[PDB]
Amino acid sequence: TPILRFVAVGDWGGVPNAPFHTAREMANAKAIATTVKTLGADFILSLGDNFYFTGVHDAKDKRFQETFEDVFSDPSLRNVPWHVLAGNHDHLGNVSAQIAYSKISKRWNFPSPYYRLRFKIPRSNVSVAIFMLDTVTLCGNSDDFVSQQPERPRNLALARTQLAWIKKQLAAAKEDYVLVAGHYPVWSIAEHGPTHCLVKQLLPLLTTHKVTAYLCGHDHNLQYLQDENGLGFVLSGAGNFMDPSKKHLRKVPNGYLRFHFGAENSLGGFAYVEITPKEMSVTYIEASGKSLFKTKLPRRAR
Numbered sequence: 001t002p003i004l005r006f007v008a009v010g011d012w013g014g015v016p017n018a019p020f021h022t023a024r025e026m027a028n029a030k031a032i033a034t035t036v037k038t039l040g041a042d043f044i045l046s047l048g049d050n051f052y053f054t055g056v057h058d059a060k061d062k063r064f065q066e067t068f069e070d071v072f073s074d075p076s077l078r079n080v081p082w083h084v085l086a087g088n089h090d091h092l093g094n095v096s097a098q099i100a101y102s103k104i105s106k107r108w109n110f111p112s113p114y115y116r117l118r119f120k121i122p123r124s125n126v127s128v129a130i131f132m133l134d135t136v137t138l139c140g141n142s143d144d145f146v147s148q149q150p151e152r153p154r155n156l157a158l159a160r161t162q163l164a165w166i167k168k169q170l171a172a173a174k175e176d177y178v179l180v181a182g183h184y185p186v187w188s189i190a191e192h193g194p195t196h197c198l199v200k201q202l203l204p205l206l207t208t209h210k211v212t213a214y215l216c217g218h219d220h221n222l223q224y225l226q227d228e229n230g231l232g233f234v235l236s237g238a239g240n241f242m243d244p245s246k247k248h249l250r251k252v253p254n255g256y257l258r259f260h261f262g263a264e265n266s267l268g269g270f271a272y273v274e275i276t277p278k279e280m281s282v283t284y285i286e287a288s289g290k291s292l293f294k295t296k297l298p299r300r301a302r
């Protein structure tokens, strides 16, 4: 009965033309509010691409109210904190602005490009670490390249510094559950597919240090993947767009893909995570309210 609950939504950032949201973003705002009202949520994780298509200009940019506050304004969301990280489109604009906005909106929590969250599951001593990454400063901005793959970071020292931080943090983490989150995927069968930078540089750390799951967006669909070590991959990038691409199906090792939903007639959806002392589970919920897939992930034990 002790439980931690949160929604993970990716790539919800509306549009820069009025009315500054899509039909899909509005459906997911309503669907998330209903989920929060009916099942509860202790917080919401944004998996990046918070403001399409070029982010915000500064912390008083009106897109913060137009695409974020006014869209996710249903009353059940009133007191629900958001923990945010950046995607590639955010980085085309002013990312310091989205960090500074944390001081303007109470529920907006974005203290740094990368940072560590730590929770105690209520009514228990079980602990959860969530490391929020900036995969754009780690790997590069996909929008810098015709390939739309982050081929190289713009600043080597900045990339190597975050990698060192992740190394040291994951080797020291004592929590029962360790989640890692970033915008770009490790594995994905869809339009961008796997990020070579993360597969080479992040995935060995996730494996070595017994991470429960990596959460991401960036590909505009819903996927669950799991490798032969039981490391889970929660891809939730369907807050604003639905891309049915299977372009990179053959770039993901056979068997890793356990669930995929990208139907273009869908309004999108999101992932709902529940963590108890017993186990972690993730439910993929469509913007229509239908449960699409649910699976459990183990307690790492520590």
Ligand SMILES: *[C@@H]1O[C@H](CO)[C@@H](O[C@@H]2O[C@H](CO)[C@@H](O[C@@H]3O[C@H](CO)[C@@H](O)[C@H](O[C@@H]4O[C@H](CO)[C@@H](O)[C@H](O)[C@@H]4O)[C@@H]3O)[C@H](O)[C@H]2NC(C)=O)[C@H](O)[C@H]1NC(C)=O
Binding pocket: 057, 058, 059, 060, 094, 096, 097, 100
């Ligand atoms: C990326 O985003 C950053 C975060 O918004 C932004 O940094 C902010 O820049 C603004 C504008 O320079 C700063 O806001 C002003 O601070 C002064 C104090 O010097 C206030 O007096 C001032 O008053 C307002 O601004 C007008 C100034 O021309 C004034 O006439 C108006 O009437 C009004 O009084 C503003 O409050 C703010 O402190 C900065 N914040 C931080 C956290 O640095 C960056 O500029 C932006 N970068 C880029 C490249 O766009």
Ligand SMILES: NC(=O)CC[C@H](N)C(=O)O
Binding pocket: 001, 002, 003, 004, 040, 121, 122, 123
């Ligand atoms: N807000 C809540 O419902 C917190 C209680 C939660 N059901 C728990 O057992 O920890």
Ligand SMILES: NC(=O)CC[C@H](N)C(=O)O
Binding pocket: 005, 036, 037, 039, 040, 041, 042, 043, 076, 079, 080
């Ligand atoms: N803010 C809310 O009322 C959502 C549910 C509550 N945060 C819980 O965890 O039970």
Ligand SMILES: NC(=O)CC[C@H](N)C(=O)O
Binding pocket: 016, 052, 053, 054, 143
């Ligand atoms: N929306 C704009 O004005 C620019 C968009 C940006 N060039 C992109 O590739 O997404």
Ligand SMILES: NC(=O)CC[C@H](N)C(=O)O
Binding pocket: 069, 070, 072, 073, 074, 075, 077, 078, 079, 107
């Ligand atoms: N009324 C509004 O501007 C919507 C956001 C509101 N402050 C909330 O937390 O729900």
Ligand SMILES: NC(=O)CC[C@H](N)C(=O)O
Binding pocket: 095, 096, 099, 112, 113, 114
């Ligand atoms: N070095 C850092 O992690 C801070 C980066 C800076 N706040 C930015 O995103 O513009």
Ligand SMILES: NC(=O)CC[C@H](N)C(=O)O
Binding pocket: 111, 112, 114, 115, 116, 117
């Ligand atoms: N949640 C956090 O611990 C935020 C850490 C952030 N890097 C800071 O020191 O400002």
Ligand SMILES: NC(=O)CC[C@H](N)C(=O)O
Binding pocket: 116, 117, 118, 119
């Ligand atoms: N805001 C939170 O609850 C997470 C903070 C986390 N305990 C840290 O110090 O890094």
Ligand SMILES: NC(=O)CC[C@H](N)C(=O)O
Binding pocket: 125, 126, 127, 174, 175, 176, 301, 302
């Ligand atoms: N190590 C922790 O954070 C939780 C305590 C211990 N894993 C237990 O529940 O038995």
Ligand SMILES: NC(=O)CC[C@H](N)C(=O)O
Binding pocket: 091, 136, 137, 138, 139, 140, 141, 152, 153, 154, 155, 158, 159
């Ligand atoms: N870290 C930086 O150089 C800033 C982001 C830049 N887009 C990158 O390639 O990483």
Ligand SMILES: NC(=O)CC[C@H](N)C(=O)O
Binding pocket: 092, 143, 144
């Ligand atoms: N127009 C584009 O290709 C988007 C990228 C953006 N102009 C940049 O500075 O990287």
Ligand SMILES: NC(=O)CC[C@H](N)C(=O)O
Binding pocket: 140, 144, 152, 153, 154
């Ligand atoms: N600005 C550019 O010329 C491209 C930047 C890119 N990060 C690279 O070094 O390949």
Ligand SMILES: NC(=O)CC[C@H](N)C(=O)O
Binding pocket: 158, 161
């Ligand atoms: N070395 C320090 O004093 C802090 C550096 C800082 N973390 C940065 O990369 O921007």
Ligand SMILES: NC(=O)CC[C@H](N)C(=O)O
Binding pocket: 147, 148, 191, 192, 243
């Ligand atoms: N859908 C997108 O954002 C771009 C994907 C495009 N099909 C490609 O060349 O990879």
Ligand SMILES: NC(=O)CC[C@H](N)C(=O)O
Binding pocket: 147, 148, 149, 150, 191, 192, 193
């Ligand atoms: N990451 C992407 O956007 C797709 C790149 C693809 N692997 C190519 O080389 O064309």
Ligand SMILES: NC(=O)CC[C@H](N)C(=O)O
Binding pocket: 199, 203, 253
């Ligand atoms: N064990 C495996 O086959 C995984 C693939 C490997 N991580 C790669 O670089 O593609």
